Amino acid sequence: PVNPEKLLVITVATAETEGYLRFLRSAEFFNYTVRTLGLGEEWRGGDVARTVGGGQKVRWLKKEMEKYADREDMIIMFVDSYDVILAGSPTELLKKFVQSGSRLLFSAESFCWPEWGLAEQYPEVGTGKRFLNSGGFIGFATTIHQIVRQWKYKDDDDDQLFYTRLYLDPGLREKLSLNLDHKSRIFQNLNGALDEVVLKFDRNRVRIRNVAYDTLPIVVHGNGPTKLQLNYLGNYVPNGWTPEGGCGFCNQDRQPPPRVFLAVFVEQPTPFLPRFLQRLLLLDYPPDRVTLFLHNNEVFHEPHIADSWPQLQDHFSAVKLVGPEEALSPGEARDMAMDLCRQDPECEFYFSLDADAVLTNLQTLRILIEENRKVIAPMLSRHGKLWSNFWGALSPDEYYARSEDYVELVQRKRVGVWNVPYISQAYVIRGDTLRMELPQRDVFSGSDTDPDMAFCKSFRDKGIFLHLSNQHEFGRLLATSRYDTEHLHPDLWQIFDNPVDWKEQYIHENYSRALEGEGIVEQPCPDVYWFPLLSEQMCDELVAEMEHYGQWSGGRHEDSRLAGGYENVPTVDIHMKQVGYEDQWLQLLRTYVGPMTESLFPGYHTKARAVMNFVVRYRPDEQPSLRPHHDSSTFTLNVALNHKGLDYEGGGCRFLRYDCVISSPRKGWALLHPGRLTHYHEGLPTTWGTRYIMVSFVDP
Amino acid sequence: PVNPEKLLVITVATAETEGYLRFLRSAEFFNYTVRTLGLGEEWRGGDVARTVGGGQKVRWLKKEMEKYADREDMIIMFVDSYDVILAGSPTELLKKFVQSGSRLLFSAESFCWPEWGLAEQYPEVGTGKRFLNSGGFIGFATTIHQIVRQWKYKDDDDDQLFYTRLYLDPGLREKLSLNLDHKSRIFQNLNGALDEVVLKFDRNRVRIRNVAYDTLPIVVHGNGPTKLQLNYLGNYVPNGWTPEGGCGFCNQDRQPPPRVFLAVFVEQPTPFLPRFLQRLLLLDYPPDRVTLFLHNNEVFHEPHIADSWPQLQDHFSAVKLVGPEEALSPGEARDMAMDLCRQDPECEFYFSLDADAVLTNLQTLRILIEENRKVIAPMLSRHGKLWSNFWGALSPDEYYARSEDYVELVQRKRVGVWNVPYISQAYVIRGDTLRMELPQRDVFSGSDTDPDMAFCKSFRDKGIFLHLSNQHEFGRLLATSRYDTEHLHPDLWQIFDNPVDWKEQYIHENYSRALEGEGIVEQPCPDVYWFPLLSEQMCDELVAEMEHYGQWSGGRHEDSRLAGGYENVPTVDIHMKQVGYEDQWLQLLRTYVGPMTESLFPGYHTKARAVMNFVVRYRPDEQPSLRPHHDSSTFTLNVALNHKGLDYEGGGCRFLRYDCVISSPRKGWALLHPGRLTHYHEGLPTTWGTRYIMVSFVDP
Ligand SMILES: *[C@@H]1O[C@H](CO)[C@@H](O[C@@H]2O[C@H](CO)[C@@H](O)[C@H](O)[C@H]2NC(C)=O)[C@H](O)[C@H]1NC(C)=O
Ligand SMILES: *[C@@H]1O[C@H](CO)[C@@H](O[C@@H]2O[C@H](CO)[C@@H](O)[C@H](O)[C@H]2NC(C)=O)[C@H](O)[C@H]1NC(C)=O
Ligand SMILES: O=c1ccn([C@@H]2O[C@H](COP(=O)(O)OP(=O)(O)O)[C@@H](O)[C@H]2O)c(=O)[nH]1
Ligand SMILES: O=c1ccn([C@@H]2O[C@H](COP(=O)(O)OP(=O)(O)O)[C@@H](O)[C@H]2O)c(=O)[nH]1
Ligand SMILES: *[C@@H]1O[C@H](CO)[C@@H](O)[C@H](O)[C@H]1NC(C)=O
Ligand SMILES: *[C@@H]1O[C@H](CO)[C@@H](O)[C@H](O)[C@H]1NC(C)=O
Ligand SMILES: O=C(O)CCC(=O)C(=O)O
Ligand SMILES: O=C(O)CCC(=O)C(=O)O
Ligand SMILES: [Fe+2]
Ligand SMILES: [Fe+2]
Ligand SMILES: [Fe+2]
Ligand SMILES: [Fe+2]
Ligand SMILES: [Mn+2]
Ligand SMILES: [Mn+2]
């Protein structure tokens, strides 16, 4: 049993990148001892991501090995560090190395690289990997010194070609007992074997298994174009996220804060923007520490921005607006806002927030800053769907692809902080990173590629991790796809596309409490119920939308009201049909009125059918009253729309068989009463002003 | 101006018949002085109604005139008495006689009778009547003596031929100044001139006018086959009935009573016969003075007669039943009952009452006896129509015809006692008249003619008046035309044909009072009303009709009840459709439930539509209860049909939204409640016995 104290891991790293630090964390988890070569130096090995190179690694290793040229008692493992993680213990590693019977065991891979022509010189292997990969090897210190000392080449010559040529010397291969880990017992190279690797979970750690050979590799190498697949594995292996411990590097459970540049982007017509702008004032972060940049590309939103701007200017440390007149593209505007933070050494963090992002968590900015990442996004999801502001995987064309764990993350079955290839709509970036690592201005622009993909590719090309937190509930994404802007108040028509935000804006704030009981719903007249339904904003916008239509009812108009033996009781009204709001109002009936009716009339079941939906206008100048009648409905919904006293002086509704009067209606509240037989009712005259009400004859 | 004291009216009458007495009354009304010849004697003039004769009249007149052979100061008018009425005063008569310039003026007529061949010998008259009629003439006593003294012929030779021959002597006609009243200035003979005669009314007397000649005759003569037309005129002329005095000979405003034979005839299946038999016990006339004869031709009515017979035998002085086993024809039975009174000298009055006659006036028998007529019928009319138990006129074939005043009599615009050609269904006949004037047994029988017409013709042939009183309200006639006898209780199906009697038998006696208000209708639960609807007899017969059908509901039966989201609430029931009682029950809803609903729910209008009408049976053995549900109706009618405690031990109806229970239902009473939304209701379990209810889901 070889002593683990005799094992030394050697790797090369010119900077403490996130990949190098990810490697070190995996090494410390198994109590390895690591020696890092080259931390101070500038990299002369070439563009190794692009082409051959890395000879500088062999030069540094050769110098380091002269210490141990005679140490037959020492086992040394050399691995890359930027794209490698450790998945097993030194004891298991040394056990498998002895089992191999080799004195220097190289990792194996599917491709003969760089010189494909040398594939014939390799020994035949039946089912395993045939060719050498220099990203990982392990052997006696003496044997390794005999190989690396033969290096006398350029810093940008290929390291793998150097090792391949020595391995293909049959006499040297037999002399020094050189071997390749054909079946990935120790080394797993991902390039060319992605379908062979799966995650194997345990209680408090995660490994990988090669299902082609049924092995549990020690070293995971994301060589070549498998960096993102390694990022995926590195979220779990070895202690990134575990079934019983949760994530291993997140904050989990949570004197002046850093100064922040907050950039807001309005690049399309987006619903509920006045609500978004008001929400900026509620973010829980000292506003004197926040600088606001807002780009609006939409002339539709200029009035919305103008209403909010006095409050925003009075709130934040400094504000700046770039409107549609500047004719900035989305990529140009995002480059401008980011470079404003980059060129200001007082900007410690950059917070980009798009208009379709709804932050329900007011501590979002704090939470993300505590995570101490270069780049991190909060997970935001379109309500009740899978689409969200990140991608778990990339297609070979670098377009969208679904990762194996994407649904678990979106549904928050696994929570933590995740290294992902794509983020959008909301993220926090270290200002230091913009200055020192992404100094160029063309982050979002410079090519035909879409700005938000260019942004993510710019960071991936520099080896910067894009982090995503679902550790908390942060918010949601608004649907903006088919936002019909040709209305006086377009957000009235948003009941289908954004029902959660629609409810918060237009449904009475005390509706939900009344639906659950606890003494809000009133019964002012025998079987007449009274409950809050619409918010004042809903009432004002519905009335305004009616007057904007303008074509109120007149003579020869017929409503479905029963008086005596004739249905000849009319009102000056506008039906939802004529303004194209019928489908919308019927959705409100199904969702909010239906369930309220079934609760107040136990035993009755409703699907909220209604062909008669209309707003009535009472005025002394035209039609101030409504004579006694029955409604052609099973029950009737009657919603006030303005204020008694402020907007009109006049009575409400009188139920004659009870001599009961609703004399003071409440603006947001709705009356619910039977329509036939028993509640013969009358609309008392409006004596001054204008009285608006909304009425539906439901279940006729 | 000729003195009225010098005028003597002479007539012939062998008996004081009603026609002779009618003549005398008209004569006394104008203060005429009348001398009647022949009152003691037997008539030897022959069958004057059949053929020629009446020479006995001339013989008596000749003897009488020998007193006045020299009295040139005396004017004498000879007229028949049985078929003559006086319409004008002696002053007007004497004025018109002088105006004629005649010394003996005969009445004129259209027909040359008896010898038609003598028509050539008559003088030509342009437009008036050409021929002599001996039924009336007026002239100086001396001139009349010169003519009548030439009589030397048989008692059964023709009187008119005798006068005609003397008038056709041209020398004698010129000598004695004989003339004919060509234009009916004094005498109106009806035969051949019916279209010329109309009634002329005044305040307190009635005359006739001849519209062909524009005259106001003094003497109205119903000669030949115009006796019935004279009967018609005699109801008015001269003081029979007047616009301001009413009728002139009726009782108008009303110690042992006479003994009466009451005969009841059941000659067809007739509705509500048990009610008729019970009504016999309520007639206001001392029952110890009444003998009962009842002929039933219907085996259908044998059980009805049997139930009533102990009460009738205990009530009246004597009773006798002749049932269907005797196989008597209607004419044979009516002859038998009438001859029973005829052969009993203790029978002072005979009262024939048919089963379709409903006597609402319990004093009918008294009232008619006070009228002191030989024969009199009470006017009885089929409800709301013109058909009644008398004819005002006869066709030439002696079948039905409408008289000019028939509608005024039936509608009681003119009330009184009327001489009519036909009566039926109810009449009172003097026993003396049966013994002395109609002694034969074949009154109703003896010929192919219908029995009730034979009866009337038998009296008309004897000159007996058939009187009819509409001076009071007496009752009505039941419709019996299409009485469907194939039911367990056929009178349940009588709602259309006899609605007044149907209501009194089956509608709750206190229903009408409740419909008018005054604290009968109750509201035991909020909008649930409770009112008496059906009588106990209706409930018992409806239940019995249901069990007689027997085919109650079972598994897979579906009623239109709403529970949760499904219409799967069934009951063990029988619908009115399956027993053929739907149309009948719908008529009850329209007539009685509809108006009750519109009164209790002001503003609601109903036509009482209902497709779901059914009787429910609750039993512990099968289905004792009914789970909570809504009815598929605007409102629901729920009628108990038997007794809580006596027939079943179990709860009634529970309305859950009110925690209100109808624990003790009332047999005849009905519940009225809304069917949808608000009155979720439950049928509490029946724990013992059987519970029957009737329910209609109206206005679905
Ligand atoms: C929703 O309910 C809350 C509490 O029941 C209401 O808050 C009250 O508002 C009135 C005036 O609007 C104040 O006088 C009370 O002091 C408030 N009570 C509390 C506990 O804050 C609120 O008004 C309701 N919302 C609407 C739109 O009516
Ligand atoms: C119809 O109403 C009358 C009077 O309102 C009811 O007569 C009463 O009947 C009860 C027993 O049924 C007696 O105790 C009372 O003394 C009666 N009152 C009078 C004034 O006679 C009659 O019962 C009602 N009819 C039905 C079928 O219930
Ligand atoms: O700027 C650099 C680039 C490379 N490396 C080291 O050289 C190794 C080879 O780089 P890479 O993993 O990207 O090449 P690949 O394994 O994909 O062939 C890295 O893991 C680092 O340890 C370094 O230290 N600094
Ligand atoms: O039994 C009779 C029949 C006849 N008359 C008298 O004779 C008249 C002639 O009879 P009738 O009127 O019936 O004959 P008509 O006028 O129709 O020719 C009657 O009016 C009676 O006054 C009579 O006294 N007793
Ligand atoms: C690593 O070493 C420490 C002592 O420095 C020891 O407490 C710990 O248990 C070791 N962990 C593993 C996984 O070997
Ligand atoms: C008839 O005579 C009486 C007197 O006997 C007289 O009072 C009455 O007025 C007379 N009536 C007529 C109509 O002449
Ligand atoms: O004016 C009111 O409050 C009553 C209106 C009404 O009943 C109707 O629209 O049918
Ligand atoms: O049993 C009862 O009284 C209720 C019956 C009922 O509600 C029904 O027939 O629908
Ligand atoms: Fe309307
Ligand atoms: Fe209404
Ligand atoms: Fe049924
Ligand atoms: Fe029911
Ligand atoms: Mn590598
Ligand atoms: Mn006559």
Curated annotation (Swiss-Prot), chains A, B:
User: May I have one GO cellular component term?
Assistant: endoplasmic reticulum
Q: Which cofactor does it need?
A: Fe(2+); L-ascorbate; Mn(2+)
Q: What is the effect of changing residue 176 to I?
A: Reduced glucosyltransferase activity
GO MF terms listed in the record are: iron ion binding; L-ascorbic acid binding; metal ion binding; procollagen galactosyltransferase activity; procollagen glucosyltransferase activity; procollagen-lysine 5-dioxygenase activity; small molecule binding
Species of the source: Homo sapiens
Q: What does this protein do?
A: Multifunctional enzyme that catalyzes a series of essential post-translational modifications on Lys residues in procollagen. Plays a redundant role in catalyzing the formation of hydroxylysine residues in -Xaa-Lys-Gly- sequences in collagens. Plays a redundant role in catalyzing the transfer of galactose onto hydroxylysine groups, giving rise to galactosyl 5-hydroxylysine. Has an essential role by catalyzing the subsequent transfer of glucose moieties, giving rise to 1,2-glucosylgalactosyl-5-hydroxylysine residues.
Chain residues that bind UDP: 12-14, 80-82, 224-227
Substitution effect: residue 43 to A:
Decreased lysyl hydroxylase activity and loss of glycosyltransferase activity
Catalytic activity as recorded in UniProt: L-lysyl-[collagen] + 2-oxoglutarate + O2 = (5R)-5-hydroxy-L-lysyl-[collagen] + succinate + CO2; (5R)-5-hydroxy-L-lysyl-[collagen] + UDP-alpha-D-galactose = (5R)-5-O-(beta-D-galactosyl)-5-hydroxy-L-lysyl-[collagen] + UDP + H(+); (5R)-5-O-(beta-D-galactosyl)-5-hydroxy-L-lysyl-[collagen] + UDP-alpha-D-glucose = (5R)-5-O-[alpha-D-glucosyl-(1->2)-beta-D-galactosyl]-5-hydroxy-L-lysyl-[collagen] + UDP + H(+)
Keywords assigned by UniProt, alphabetized: Dioxygenase, Disease variant, Disulfide bond, Endoplasmic reticulum, Glycoprotein, Glycosyltransferase, Iron, Manganese, Membrane, Metal-binding, Multifunctional enzyme, Oxidoreductase, Secreted, Signal, Transferase, Vitamin C
Which GO annotations describe the biological process of this protein? basement membrane assembly; collagen fibril organization; collagen metabolic process; endothelial cell morphogenesis; epidermis morphogenesis; hydroxylysine biosynthetic process; in utero embryonic development; lung morphogenesis
**Membrane topology, as annotated:** Peripheral membrane protein
> PROSITE patterns per the record?
FE2OG_OXY, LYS_HYDROXYLASE
| Positions bound to 2-oxoglutarate | 561, 618, 638, 691
Quote the InterPro entries the UniProt record gives.
Answer: Collagen_mod_GT25, IPNS-like_FE2OG_OXY, Nucleotide-diphossugar_trans, Oxoglu/Fe-dep_dioxygenase_dom, Pro_4_hyd_alph, Procol_lys_dOase
Q: What is this protein called?
A: Multifunctional procollagen lysine hydroxylase and glycosyltransferase LH3
Chief location bin = endoplasmic reticulum
Q: Which residues are glycosylated?
A: 31, 510
The EC number(s) given in the record are 1.14.11.4, 2.4.1.50, 2.4.1.66
Q: Where is this region: Important for dimerization?
A: 634-677
Q: Where does Fe cation bind?
A: 629, 631, 681
Ranges for the region named Accessory region are 257-482
Q: Which PANTHER family match?
A: MULTIFUNCTIONAL PROCOLLAGEN LYSINE HYDROXYLASE AND GLYCOSYLTRANSFERASE LH3, PROCOLLAGEN-LYSINE,2-OXOGLUTARATE 5-DIOXYGENASE/GLYCOSYLTRANSFERASE 25 FAMILY MEMBER
Tissue specificity: Ubiquitous. Detected in heart, placenta and pancreas and at lower levels in lung, liver and skeletal muscle.
